[PDB]
């Protein structure tokens, strides 16, 4: 029987749980969906866990005492509130855990300065996920069959990790020969099991000082929380700092620590991981539906992406289209056909070449800036594991591996050696990377979009000598890149005037609306080619072979594959489902300025 203390934490929180009805409809939708989830699985043929997000908002405006008690000694208020919450689950119609979401300036400190203070409290820690261990299940409930009596039995096992209170440990040996001497034949399947995982978290390098030895702690996960993180991200972790173990006083330092009762939140980096958690309201999409009913919004989106840069109209138009990415149609039992678009630009220095690059990085999603050399692990993983648990070989995902469904920013492309350029033919064309070293030959997938930037060989001689061999690049790399933009050094006065007041007003519709409009178009706007799309480009591509060869070079059928992608990405902008001839009229003009 519980005491008076235990029920009072219940009834006070039950008073709060009756205070706000927003969480009532939450658990209602949990139960109805999982009922309907089992309803469709068991009627025609003849997943979700139990936790609800509670903010750290309302407890301050309800009970400042119950506010305070959690933030110091959480080991008294967490069990009865859950017991009261499992009461609500049983009354309105299994752990039924919680979140404790909420921002607080109390204990959001660095893990670097965490030790020996604020022990047995609840601390919010962020940092780097590294050296993720293996996923193991845990034994809980054993099932045994006795032969002659013909009945089953019952036996449980517990550990100190889950319970959060120091209870008297009672170990029990795994049973054999129980009562009279019948053999306890073991069974499985009905014996229950729950997965288990432990990981280490390094602190933030951007928060770190200049150079010192980093120090870290460990986090053990729970059943529905196993394996949400790959090693190498930025994740906020909210849990309770608990120290277990007999600290060396049995028979030189004990009291090793850990953090349990946890919730895991991956957060966006500058250049790592997902940023697609941005919501869309009905108020949001109604603005998009009001926006997409126009006739000239491609121009407005073109002029939008030069917030501080004069000119370069047709360059910006393609930068919309690469983030559209084209359509992907993998053939039936054949191969995929590549859909993304890769562009290199060239021009004289101090002409907004480096004023373009981070704008491509920050506006887009899942981008990696690759600068200078890319030696030994950018396109590769290098398989260097000396794992102390067992002699084996695993991988550490390189940047080209990591930038899948994304953008790779290549800076100073001409300074790259020929070594990694072998891999670029493999990456840009077959969309796969196969690594075959003596441990394990492998094969993986990476379909990144690529923008690189190279200089001329000597001087600013961009137009003087000849258009051929201003770069002196290998021949297939011409065929790898789709459009090759040449930026001139035109000296004028009217053009200088447009430079003049632009920079002067600089030092004295929007971007966050834009990426909502971008990521919405990915999952519902892919179009399909129509009959009108053939008749123009058949006439047009013959002109591309018959007369462009009298001016420049080369013309491959791979160029016609890009002609499909340009009309494809243009239909994504208008969010049409068919493909119009006007999309080709846009796409035909894009080759003329890029080349002639």
């Amino acid at each position: 029987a519980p005491d008076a203390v235990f029920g009072d934490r219940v009834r006070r929180f039950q008073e709060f749980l009756d205070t706000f009805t927003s969480y009532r409809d939450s658990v209602r939708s949990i139960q109805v969906y999982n009922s309907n989830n089992a309803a469709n699985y068991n009627d025609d043929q003849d997943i979700l866990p139990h936790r609800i997000i509670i903010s750290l908002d309302d407890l301050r405006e309800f009970d400042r005492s119950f506010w305070s008690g959690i933030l110091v000694e959480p080991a008294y208020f967490i069990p009865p509130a859950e017991k009261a919450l499992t009461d609500l689950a049983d009354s309105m119609d299994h752990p039924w855990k919680l979140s404790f979401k909420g921002s607080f300036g109390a204990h959001a400190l660095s893990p670097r300065t965490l030790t020996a203070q604020h022990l047995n409290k609840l601390v919010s820690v962020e940092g780097i996920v590294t050296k993720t261990s293996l996923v193991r299940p845990k034994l809980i409930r054993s099932v045994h069959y006795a032969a002659k009596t013909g009945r089953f039995h019952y036996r449980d096992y517990t550990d100190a990790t889950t319970t959060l209170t120091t209870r008297i440990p009672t170990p029990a040996i795994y049973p054999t020969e129980d009562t009279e001497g019948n053999k306890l034949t073991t069974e499985y399947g009905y014996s229950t099991f729950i997965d288990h995982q432990r990981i280490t978290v390094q602190e933030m390098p951007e928060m770190a000082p200049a150079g010192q030895l980093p120090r870290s702690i460990d986090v053990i996960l729970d059943d529905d929380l196993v394996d949400k993180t790959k090693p190498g991200d930025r994740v906020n972790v909210v849990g309770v700092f608990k120290s277990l173990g007999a600290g060396g006083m049995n028979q030189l330092i004990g009291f090793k620590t850990l953090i349990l009762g946890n919730t895991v939140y991956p957060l966006h980096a500058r250049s790592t991981g997902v940023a697609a958690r941005q919501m869309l309201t009905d108020f949001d999409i109604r603005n998009i539906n009001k926006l997409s009913k126009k006739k000239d919004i491609f121009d407005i989106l073109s002029q939008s992406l030069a917030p501080s840069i004069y000119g370069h109209d047709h360059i910006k138009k393609a930068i919309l289209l690469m983030l559209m990415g084209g359509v992907e149609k993998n053939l039936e039992n054949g191969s995929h056909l590549r859909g993304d678009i890769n562009i290199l630009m060239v021009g004289d220095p101090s002409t907004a070449k480096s004023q373009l690059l981070r704008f491509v990085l920050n506006t887009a999603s899942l981008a990696i800036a690759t600068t200078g050399r890319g030696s030994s692990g950018v396109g590769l993983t290098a398989a260097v594991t000396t794992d102390r648990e067992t002699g084996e070989r695993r991988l550490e995902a390189g940047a080209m591996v990591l930038a899948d469904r994304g953008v790779v920013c290549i800076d100073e492309f001409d300074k790259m050696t020929d070594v990694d350029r072998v891999a670029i033919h493999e990456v840009m064309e077959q969309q796969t990377v196969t690594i075959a070293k003596a441990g394990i030959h492998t094969t993986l997938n990476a379909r990144c979009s690529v923008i690189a930037a190279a200089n001329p060989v000597f001087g600013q001689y961009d137009v003087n000598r000849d258009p051929h061999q201003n770069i002196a690049l290998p021949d297939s790399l011409l065929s790898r890149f789709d459009l090759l933009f040449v930026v001139t050094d035109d000296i004028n006065e009217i053009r200088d005037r447009s430079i003049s007041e632009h920079v002067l007003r600089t030092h004295r519709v929007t971007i966050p609306f834009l990426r909502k409009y971008v990521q919405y178009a990915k999952e519902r706007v892919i179009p399909q080619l129509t009959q009108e799309a053939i008749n123009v480009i058949v006439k047009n591509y013959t002109d591309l072979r018959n007369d462009d060869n009298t001016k420049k070079s080369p013309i491959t059928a791979r160029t016609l594959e890009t002609l499909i992608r340009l009309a494809t990405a243009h239909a994504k902008v208008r969010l049409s489902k068919t493909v119009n001839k006007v999309d080709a009229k846009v796409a035909a003009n894009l080759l003329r300025f890029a080349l002639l």
Binding site: D3, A4, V5, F6
Partner: protein
């Protein structure tokens, strides 16, 4: 381990109301038991006799004139052992202490308790001098003296005794209340 139980028995307001009944009683010149306590302070008597009837008379009196009294007859009737000293420390709050100059032939017990009364206060007078002499309203200045000095306990110097007294059925005949304490019961009837 070792849980807790709440029960309707209180110790707080019962101690408050028992102070008032120990002060406010006029019926049977001035207050009854303070004149008795002054007779105890006269140092000529060793017993304190408490009935249950004036309690019940007071408990009749408070409901008829005021809103509500906590029940105190059946409160004492249940446990009855904690009511010895928790009642008796409220007695030492109010006392006409110097009411007679001490006799030279009074009691050899009396001269010892007069010391421990005085040795308490002279030790109390020392510590309040040092603290005001080393500064950096005086209730906290009084409060610092309270916890920094070992003293004689007030349980150690009492000199008197207290015996309870059961209620007759006679007033219980007028108003029936918890009159279960006074029946001619047998040792065989002692379950």
């Amino acid at each position: 381990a070792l849980p807790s139980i709440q029960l309707p028995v209180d110790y707080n307001n019962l101690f408050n109301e028992i102070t008032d009944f120990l002060v406010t009683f006029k019926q049977d010149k001035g207050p009854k038991y303070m004149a008795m306590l002054q007779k105890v302070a006269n140092r000529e008597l060793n017993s304190v006799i408490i009935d249950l009837d004036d309690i019940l008379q007071y408990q009749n009196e408070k409901f008829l004139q005021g809103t509500q009294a906590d029940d105190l007859v059946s409160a004492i009737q249940q446990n009855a052992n904690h009511f010895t000293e928790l009642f008796c420390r409220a007695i030492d709050n109010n006392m006409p202490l110097p009411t007679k100059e001490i006799d030279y032939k009074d009691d050899v017990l009396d001269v010892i308790l007069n010391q421990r009364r005085l040795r308490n206060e002279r030790m109390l007078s020392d510590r309040t001098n040092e603290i005001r002499s080393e500064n950096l309203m005086n209730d906290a200045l009084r409060e610092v003296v309270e916890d920094e000095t070992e003293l004689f306990p007030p349980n150690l110097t009492r000199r008197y005794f207290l015996y309870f007294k059961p209620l007759s059925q006679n007033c219980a005949r007028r108003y029936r209340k918890k009159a279960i304490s006074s029946k001619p019961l047998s040792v065989r009837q002692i379950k």
